[PDB]
Write a structure and sequence with these properties.
The PDB classes it as transferase. The entry lists the keywords mitotic checkpoint kinase, chromosome instability, cancer, tetratricopeptide repeat (TPR) motif, mitotic checkpoint, transferase. The assembly is monomeric. This protein is mostly helical. It has 7 helices and no strands. 70% of the residues lie in helices and 0% in strands. Helix 2 runs antiparallel to helix 3 (49-65) and helix 3 (49-65) runs antiparallel to helix 4 (71-80). The longest helix has 17 residues, at 23-39. The chain is globular, with a radius of gyration of 15 Å. It binds lead (II) ion. Residues 41, 43-44 line the site of lead (II) ion.
């Protein structure tokens, strides 16, 4: 059916079956996530956890495919699913990987200020940022 859960499930299955990964299978994977986004209206799904994972997966895959273009996809996921800490952290991780440390901190702090959940995740990420690690989570 047409809901984030069945979509997310079929997407993860596609990833598991796309190993080992080539540019061609990566492209196919990304196109499939875009088809999910075309079918799932954001305003119904702003607090749906599967929908949020779909948006973050699409951004992360685009981050691999073409980093200098992916930012707008991370912003889209944050605008659509602002309640979830993992969304903001994902954005902060991408900015960090680009050397954009000040922007990475602002994302984490804005999320704390806006009450994104769970708070523990934001605190760990911010701890790691200040310990100057490469990964906000592990
Ligand atoms: Pb609508």
């Amino acid at each position: 059916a047409n809901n984030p859960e069945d979509w997310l499930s079929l997407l993860l299955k596609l990833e598991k079956n796309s190993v080992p990964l080539s540019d061609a299978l990566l492209n196919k994977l990304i196109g499939r996530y875009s088809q999910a986004i075309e079918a799932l209206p954001p305003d119904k799904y702003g607090q749906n956890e599967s929908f949020a994972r779909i948006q973050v997966r699409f951004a992360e895959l685009k981050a691999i495919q073409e980093p200098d273009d992916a930012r707008d996809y991370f912003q889209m996921a944050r605008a659509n699913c602002k309640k979830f800490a993992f969304v903001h952290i994902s954005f902060a991780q991408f900015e960090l990987s680009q050397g954009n440390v000040k922007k990475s901190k602002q994302l984490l702090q804005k999320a704390v200020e806006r009450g994104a959940v769970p708070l523990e995740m934001l605190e760990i990420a911010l701890r790691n940022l200040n310990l100057q690690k490469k990964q906000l989570l592990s």
